[PDB]
Amino acid sequence: LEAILIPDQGYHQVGPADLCTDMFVLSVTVAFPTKLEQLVPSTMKLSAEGSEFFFYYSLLGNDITSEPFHNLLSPDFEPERASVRIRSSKQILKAFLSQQPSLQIHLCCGNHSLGSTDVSLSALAGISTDLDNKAATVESAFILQPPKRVKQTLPALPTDLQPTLGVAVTLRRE
Numbered sequence: 001l002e003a004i005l006i007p008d009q010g011y012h013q014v015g016p017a018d019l020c021t022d023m024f025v026l027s028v029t030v031a032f033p034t035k036l037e038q039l040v041p042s043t044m045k046l047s048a049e050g051s052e053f054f055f056y057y058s059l060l061g062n063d064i065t066s067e068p069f070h071n072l073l074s075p076d077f078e079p080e081r082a083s084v085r086i087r088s089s090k091q092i093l094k095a096f097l098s099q100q101p102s103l104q105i106h107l108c109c110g111n112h113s114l115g116s117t118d119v120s121l122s123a124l125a126g127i128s129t130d131l132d133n134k135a136a137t138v139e140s141a142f143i144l145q146p147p148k149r150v151k152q153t154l155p156a157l158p159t160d161l162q163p164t165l166g167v168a169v170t171l172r173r174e
Contacts (some may be wrong), residue, residue, distance in 0.1 A: 001094040003060045003086065011115040012060050014088035014096050023174035024093060024131075027136040028064070030055055030105065031079035034140070037070045037133040039107060039115040039146050039163050046072075053114070055165070060084050065108075079166075085174065090131055096127035097171075105167060107144060115144040119167050128171055135172035142167050 003012040014020065036053075040046065054073075055066040064082045069075045086093060102118035119142060128136040144163040156162050 001092065001099065003096070005061070006087075011085035011087050011157050013088055015092040017087070020089035020092050022088065022089055024088060024106075024173055025083050025170075025172050025174050026059070026082055026086060027056065027172075028059055028103065029079055029081040029082040029168040029170075030057075030165060031064065031077065031168075033077055033107075033164070034141075035161055035163045036075065036107060036115075036144070039144060040072065051109065055105060058107045059084075059104060079103050080154075081128045090128075092171075093171075094125040094128055097128075098122045099125050103167075103169065105142075106167060107163075107165075113147050115163060117142040117165060117167070119169055121169065124169050124171055131171065135170055137168055137170040139166075139168035139170075141165065155161045 001014060002015050005012050011023070014067045049070060052070055053072065057064050059082055062082075062084060062168070066080050066094045067078065069077060100121045105117055105119065106113040107115045112121050121140065124136060124138045127138065130136075141164040144165055
């Protein structure tokens with residue numbers, strides 16, 4: 001199963017076009033970054049202003065970049081939503097989402113990743129038990145991790161203040 005973009009119609013076909021004809025909307029919201037400064041080592045001194053950061057992920061092969069921000073201590077980040085339209089059948093779409101790799105969201109500087117988190121799209125498929133009547137949403141604050149630590153250190157506990165990003169993934173009929 002693959003999501004084929006129909007450029008003139010602005011949706012992605014999942015399944016046979018003559019059998020799978022229902023319209024769905026898959027939305028990703030990113031919001032409320034916290035403690036992003038902890039993704040940068042304390043021995044790396046950034047100048048007060050002049051840096052530009054943003055968030056990136058890929059949604060069904062579509063590149064999604066947030067508005068830029070310049071202060072890791074206070075991103076002042078307005079919540080941002082991206083949505084893709086999908087023409088499929090309820091059962092085919094769930095199977096497709098169950099086979100997808102995790103949604104990977106990066107804190108970026110240029111083309112460098114300062115940290116990333118994974119959001120399970122197969123978990124969204126599992127809770128999509130009532131799409132005829134209610135949209136299904138996977139939502140939480142997800143922990144951001146830097147790309148490469150040199151040595152193993154004592155892991156942070158889930159109760160600890162770590163870099164996090166609010167991520168909500170919602171699936172519904174159109």
